[PDB]
Scaffold this active site. Structure first.
Site, short mmCIF file in Angstrom:
data_model
loop_
_atom_site.label_atom_id
_atom_site.label_comp_id
_atom_site.label_asym_id
_atom_site.label_seq_id
_atom_site.Cartn_x
_atom_site.Cartn_y
_atom_site.Cartn_z
N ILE A 53 -18.04 -2.10 -4.75
CA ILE A 53 -18.06 -2.83 -3.50
C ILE A 53 -19.01 -2.10 -2.55
O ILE A 53 -18.92 -0.88 -2.37
CB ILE A 53 -16.64 -2.92 -2.91
CG1 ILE A 53 -15.68 -3.71 -3.85
CG2 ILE A 53 -16.67 -3.55 -1.55
CD1 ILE A 53 -14.24 -3.89 -3.23
N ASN A 67 -6.89 -1.94 -4.32
CA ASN A 67 -7.36 -1.96 -5.68
C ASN A 67 -6.18 -1.65 -6.59
O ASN A 67 -5.31 -0.83 -6.22
CB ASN A 67 -8.45 -0.94 -5.90
CG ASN A 67 -8.92 -0.93 -7.31
OD1 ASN A 67 -9.37 -1.95 -7.81
ND2 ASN A 67 -8.81 0.25 -8.00
N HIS A 69 -5.35 -0.05 -10.04
CA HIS A 69 -6.03 0.85 -10.97
C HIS A 69 -5.03 1.39 -11.99
O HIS A 69 -3.96 1.87 -11.58
CB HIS A 69 -6.63 2.04 -10.17
CG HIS A 69 -7.43 3.01 -10.98
ND1 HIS A 69 -8.66 2.71 -11.53
CD2 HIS A 69 -7.18 4.31 -11.31
CE1 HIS A 69 -9.13 3.76 -12.18
NE2 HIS A 69 -8.25 4.75 -12.06
#
Length: 189
Positions: A53, A67, A69
């Site tokens: 990003i 996010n 992860h």
């Protein structure tokens, strides 16, 4: 409310995000910083997004971008976390965290440890991580979306890997995804 999902399209996840009466847009390609896809976007969720990003977006969406992860941060930031958790014999698990400048280093919202078993392969540990993070996200998104929770700073340390770092260990993966992990534990020290 308007959610931008970065990463591949996932029907369960769209229907989940849309049941909050949010409107959901999805994008998986590289995102120009001035793109109108971002107009009026209230929240960004990345999950399996293959691109970095741009920092100006990251800054613009401080506390509005998370996010998903599949490592136990701060271990195994970056690429192939499941493989590296066995090669480097590290903590195993999944993490929802705010998106930062830099590579998987933002604040931790919640994490969960994931166990493995003696017959496991790369495939069965990866699928377990995937189920874990997706359930964890469904548990915590109602709170994340109402600003009801916030992050603790992610500890410096842990580890980080690039896609290419695994090249010298590929010879160990004699069955690809079906390689038993027991063979791999500690092979990178």
């Amino acid at each position: 409310g308007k959610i931008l999902l970065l990463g591949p399209e996932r029907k369960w996840l769209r229907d989940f995000l849309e049941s909050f009466e949010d409107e959901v847009t999805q994008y998986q390609d590289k995102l120009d910083k001035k793109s109108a896809i971002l107009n009026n976007v209230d929240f960004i969720i990345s999950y399996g997004y293959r691109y970095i990003i741009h920092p100006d977006i990251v800054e613009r969406f401080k506390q509005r971008a998370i996010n998903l992860h599949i490592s136990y941060l701060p271990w195994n930031k970056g690429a192939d976390p499941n493989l590296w958790s066995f090669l480097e014999d590290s903590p195993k698990g999944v993490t929802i965290h705010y998106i930062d400048s830099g590579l998987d280093t933002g604040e931790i919202i919640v994490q969960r440890e994931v166990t493995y078993y003696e017959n496991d392969t790369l495939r069965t540990t990866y699928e377990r991580l995937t189920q874990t993070i997706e359930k964890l996200f469904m548990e915590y998104w109602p709170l994340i979306r109402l600003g009801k929770i916030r992050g603790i700073p992610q500890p410096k340390g842990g580890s980080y890997h690039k896609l290419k770092d695994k090249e010298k260990y590929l010879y160990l993966l004699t069955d690809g995804w079906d390689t038993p992990v027991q063979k791999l534990i500690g092979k990178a020290q």
